[PDB]
Design a protein around this ligand. Structure first.
Ligand code: MG
Ligand code: MG
Ligand code: MG
Ligand code: MG
Ligand code: MG
Length: 93
RNA sequence: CGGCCGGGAACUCAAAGGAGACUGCCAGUGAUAAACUGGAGGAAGGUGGGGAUGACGUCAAGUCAUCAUGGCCCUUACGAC
């Protein structure tokens, strides 16, 4: 039963959403003082700067393993990076 | 009325050996950086101040009168009193 990658990939493509600007969920893989690694699972676990996750008091409410929601800008950048933005989701909200 | 004189190892000082200051800490900037700026502490803060220390080479630079030395010249003389 060599399940064809064609139909498996079709299943995957209907499983997710790929368009610029789309608000998509993600898993926060790691948190650092500088950037936060998030994963929407497209081509690369992206990294978003820290201030995008800070409140008026400059607090990183977000923790590791939390499911956050960021706006995908481009699925790729020429540098092998998915580009995600939290501030865009903030504007949407 | 003078450390002067008993006296004391407190203090200056005399040298000898050590401690200390390294962006070490904090904040911001910065390119997830090197570094920079500011602040605290500190006697001292960013090489703390100063000195000694002069790479490969250039100027056929200077010195045959410090010295040494290749050559050339004088030897009753350019030597010596
Ligand atoms: Mg200072
Ligand atoms: Mg030196
Ligand atoms: Mg000459
Ligand atoms: Mg000269
Ligand atoms: Mg001359």
């Amino acid at each position: 039963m060599t399940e064809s990658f064609a139909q498996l990939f079709e299943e995957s493509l209907k499983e997710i959403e790929t368009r610029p600007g789309s608000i998509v969920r993600g898993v926060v893989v790691a948190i650092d003082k500088d950037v936060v690694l998030v994963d929407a699972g497209l081509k690369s676990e992206s990294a978003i700067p820290a201030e995008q996750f800070k409140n008026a008091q400059g607090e990183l409410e977000i923790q590791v393993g939390d499911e956050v929601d960021v706006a995908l800008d481009a699925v790729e950048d020429g540098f092998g990076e998915t580009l995600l933005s939290r501030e865009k989701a903030k504007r949407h909200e």
